Scaffold this active site. Structure first.
Site, PDB file in Angstrom:
ATOM      1  N   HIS A 126      -4.205   4.552 -18.571  1.00  0.00           N
ATOM      2  CA  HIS A 126      -3.125   4.014 -19.408  1.00  0.00           C
ATOM      3  C   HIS A 126      -3.493   4.035 -20.981  1.00  0.00           C
ATOM      4  O   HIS A 126      -2.655   4.094 -21.748  1.00  0.00           O
ATOM      5  CB  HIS A 126      -3.088   2.446 -19.067  1.00  0.00           C
ATOM      6  CG  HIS A 126      -2.627   2.046 -17.907  1.00  0.00           C
ATOM      7  ND1 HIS A 126      -3.629   2.631 -16.773  1.00  0.00           N
ATOM      8  CD2 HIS A 126      -1.847   1.059 -17.184  1.00  0.00           C
ATOM      9  CE1 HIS A 126      -3.055   1.858 -15.566  1.00  0.00           C
ATOM     10  NE2 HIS A 126      -1.963   1.266 -15.895  1.00  0.00           N
ATOM     11  N   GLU A 146       8.434  -4.792  -3.160  1.00  0.00           N
ATOM     12  CA  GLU A 146       9.403  -4.123  -3.716  1.00  0.00           C
ATOM     13  C   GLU A 146      10.827  -4.310  -3.384  1.00  0.00           C
ATOM     14  O   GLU A 146      11.695  -4.177  -4.360  1.00  0.00           O
ATOM     15  CB  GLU A 146       9.134  -2.462  -3.072  1.00  0.00           C
ATOM     16  CG  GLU A 146       7.924  -1.943  -3.435  1.00  0.00           C
ATOM     17  CD  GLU A 146       7.942  -1.530  -5.037  1.00  0.00           C
ATOM     18  OE1 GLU A 146       9.052  -1.702  -5.930  1.00  0.00           O
ATOM     19  OE2 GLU A 146       6.981  -1.060  -5.352  1.00  0.00           O
TER      20      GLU A 146
END
Lengths: 596, 192
Positions: A488, A358
């Site tokens: 998705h 991140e």
């Protein structure tokens, strides 16, 4: 005078200034919601977001009034076209409302779908978490079969007609916007035009993906044979030694990641995996020290350090009992110099790797900040997460863990644990590539209209058998819609991003390790202390999206096209070891098989 | 034998750039330590005159300007720069022999929700000139069309608001700036 280009520069200047403020408003509202779930912050987030949405719609109309036909500065033209995307507004207002109703309806069916066990009509289990742990921690073939079929029956049967009409409306939407189908709209992310030597047709994506997958097929065949062998041991009478692997046995509800099966497919069970978590907890290591080590890594390659805004405004631990917050690790770029990371860090190695991942997102954000607002993003839909993964891989190397002190000064590797590491890595990375290819191809051909509706729930499994190598445990008529059962597919997210990101991250890592002068197997390379790889990566990161994705690809890996060769070069040791251990196994599979 | 060095440097009402405040102070001659005890204050450029050369023999008249600006643009409060605050809001001459002083005001000028009171001009049909002030609030005609004196296409309000919020990064944080012009033309060391 006043040429159109000058007027467009003026307009874009006004936009890049007022936008930044409004985007900061909405980002800070979202941040205060996700760091403190109170209804007030919820409402403020919705308000700021809807105001930002209205601003963008209005500015999109005003920008569409400008003509892309008479603008000869691509750095301007790209921002203009990006804001010009009219979107689903071209559909009839009635049709637009229907489409959006279907989207939110399927998303809520998914996020509110549950299977009530016939054991007790009162008791039920949702996808998260009941069904997921049933399908990711149980071995009883009957229970796992029940859960697979139950989530694909109660939920998918519902999502079928909605997704049918969804195909209709999305096709109309893309045909209006001058795309041959909604799949062409999705593929238009890798579209590069007007730059000689770097342009990329929207179908060259299809060709390159198919050809690269042709080069990937062998490693997946040997991984399939080996996994089939170990599972054939697990379940003594349920897979054909030449048959496709069953579905409810792959590790998850859909079979997209085979990582769980590691517990049943570890090459050398006695050889434990490398986990420094205990060592961390025993060296006074706090989340502060985790993020400081991340800073230190990105500094050692040359990139800047986290601004004091990050070290002062970021939630790097679980707040406490009083506050309630999201804990899915997220990288936040609110703009205007404000960069943060939301992570409920725990003293584990997983969170160490995720912190590096991140913070790599964050560094990428910091680099492309000097660019105009519309041009602040990643080169394509898979560049970001690829950067994060190259950070994680450089970290996990035993060399790096030795350097930082979380490892012994003389911990000597063993080929068996490198096989285990590469095998776990291939179960996750290599295992999901056929799944992604197959599913996105099904959607693509459906949007083109090649697959008739009455042959949907059929073709899927054929591809599932012919490409993924998986057999359906149960025959399904067209009243089903197992595709839609993924998060998705029913929530309208383009998929190919993960395939791309994979190939990308391996190309990146190999080029960087070249600059860093690492010798030996690729899975042992650490870019630490290497300034040159840092400069190269930064030469890619600074561009954001002002130049085409092919150009940034050349700026790092030194080529204009996607290439699987780095990925196979990473997994080659495991490939040899597989071929060996599968000598006495059939490599490949057969469509025919089916437990029915 | 009197000086003010607390009125312009210690004021909670700094002016924006489009109205860069200028106060003049004569018959003064104050020392340097009064203006050398205020923390790091980024870095103060002192062109021509060397900072530690105040003493007594110096200039006559002085025109002290004060305004606010994000720290990204402090380099623009300098001779030669062509940034937005310079060629459109505030231009310093190439022969400038004064001085520049800057610090952070995130502690005071920036407010939660936005101190939009501080602002700046971004559109002007011309470049500015040394020590020039423009307070026009008139719609900016940008493309060939008789602007109806009102907002619209190629017709934008010439002033954008900074609107500071303390969480901004150092670059977008509110720096406070004060320039110290100097002139010794036909006069008896007015200050000195």
């Amino acid at each position: 005078p006043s040429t159109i280009e000058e007027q467009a520069k003026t307009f874009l200047d006004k936009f890049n200034h007022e936008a930044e403020d409004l985007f900061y408003q909405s980002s800070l509202a979202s941040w205060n919601y996700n760091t403190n779930i109170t209804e007030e912050n919820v409402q403020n987030m919705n308000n700021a977001g809807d105001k930002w949405s209205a601003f963008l719609k209005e500015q999109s109309t005003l920008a569409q009034m400008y003509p892309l036909q008479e603008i000869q500065n691509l750095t301007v033209k790209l921002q203009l076209q990006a804001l010009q995307q009219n979107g689903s507004s071209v559909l009839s207002e009635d049709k637009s409302k229907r489409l959006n109703t279907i989207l939110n309806t399927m998303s809520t069916i998914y996020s509110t779908g549950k299977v009530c066990n016939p054991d007790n009509p009162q008791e039920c289990l949702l996808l998260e978490p009941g069904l997921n742990e049933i399908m990711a921690n149980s071995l009883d073939y009957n229970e796992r079969l029940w859960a697979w079929e139950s989530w694909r029956s109660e939920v998918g049967k519902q999502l079928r007609p909605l997704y049918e009409e969804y195909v209709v409306l999305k096709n109309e939407m893309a045909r209006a916007n001058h795309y041959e189908d909604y799949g062409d709209y999705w593929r238009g992310d890798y579209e590069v035009n007007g730059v000689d030597g770097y342009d990329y047709s929207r179908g060259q994506l299809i060709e390159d993906v198919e050809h690269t997958f042709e080069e990937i097929k062998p490693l997946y065949e040997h991984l399939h044979a080996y996994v089939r062998a170990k599972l054939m041991n697990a379940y003594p009478s349920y897979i054909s030694p030449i048959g496709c692997l069953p579905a409810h046995l792959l590790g998850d509800m859909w079979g997209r990641f085979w990582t769980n099966l590691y517990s049943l497919t570890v090459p050398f069970g006695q050889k434990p995996n490398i986990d420094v978590t205990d060592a961390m907890v025993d060296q006074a290591w706090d989340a502060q020290r985790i993020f400081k080590e991340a800073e230190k890594f990105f500094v050692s390659v040359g990139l800047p350090n986290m601004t004091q805004g990050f070290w002062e405004n970021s939630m790097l631990t679980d707040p406490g009992n009083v506050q309630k917050a999201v804990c899915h690790p997220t990288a936040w770029d609110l703009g205007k110099g404000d960069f943060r990371i939301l992570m409920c860090t725990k003293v584990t190695m997983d969170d160490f790797l995720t912190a590096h991942h991140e913070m790599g997102h964050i560094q990428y954000d910091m680099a492309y900040a000097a660019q105009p607002f519309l041009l602040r993003n990643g080169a394509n839909e898979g560049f970001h997460e690829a950067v994060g993964e190259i950070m994680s891989l450089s970290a996990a190397t035993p060399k790096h863990l030795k350097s930082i002190g979380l490892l012994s000064p003389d911990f000597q590797e063993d080929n068996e644990t490198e096989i285990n590491f590469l095998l776990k890595q291939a179960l996750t990375i290599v295992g999901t590539l056929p799944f992604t290819y197959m599913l996105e191809k099904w959607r693509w051909m459906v949007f083109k209209g090649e697959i008739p509706k009455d042959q949907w729930m059929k073709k899927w499994w054929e591809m599932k058998r012919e490409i993924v190598g998986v057999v359906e445990p149960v025959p399904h008529d067209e009243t089903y819609c197992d595709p839609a059962s993924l998060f998705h597919v029913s929530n309208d997210y383009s998929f190919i991003r993960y395939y791309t990101r994979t190939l990308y991250q391996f190309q990146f890592q190999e080029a960087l390790c070249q600059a860093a002068k690492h010798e030996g197997p690729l899975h042992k390379c650490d870019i630490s202390n290497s300034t040159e790889a840092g400069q190269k990566l930064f030469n890619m990161l600074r561009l954001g999206k002002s130049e085409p994705w092919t150009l940034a690809l050349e700026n790092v890996v030194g080529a204009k096209n996607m290439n699987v060769r780095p990925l196979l070069n990473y997994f080659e040791p495991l490939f040899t070891w597989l071929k060996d251990q599968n000598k006495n196994s059939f490599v490949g599979w057969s469509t025919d098989w089916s437990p029915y | 034998n009197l000086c003010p060095f607390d009125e312009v440097f210690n004021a909670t009402t700094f002016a924006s750039v489009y109205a860069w405040n200028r106060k003049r102070i004569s018959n003064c001659v104050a020392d340097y330590s009064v203006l050398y005890n205020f923390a790091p204050f980024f870095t103060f450029k002192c062109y021509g005159v060397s900072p530690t050369k105040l003493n007594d023999l110096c200039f006559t008249n002085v025109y002290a300007d004060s305004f606010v600006i994000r720290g990204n643009e402090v380099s623009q409060i300098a001779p030669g720069q062509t940034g937005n605050i310079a060629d459109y809001n505030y231009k310093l001459p190439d022969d400038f022999t004064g001085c520049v002083i800057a610090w952070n005001s995130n502690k005071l000028d920036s407010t939660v929700g936005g101190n939009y009171n501080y602002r700046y001009r971004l559109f002007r049909k011309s470049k500015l000139k040394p020590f020039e002030r423009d307070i026009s609030t008139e719609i900016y005609q940008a493309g060939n069309k008789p602007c109806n004196g009102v907002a619209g296409v190629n017709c934008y309000f010439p002033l954008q608001s900074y609107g500071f919020r303390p969480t901004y990064g150092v670059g977008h944080q509110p720096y406070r700036v004060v320039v110290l012009s100097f002139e010794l033309l036909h006069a008896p060391a007015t200050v000195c």
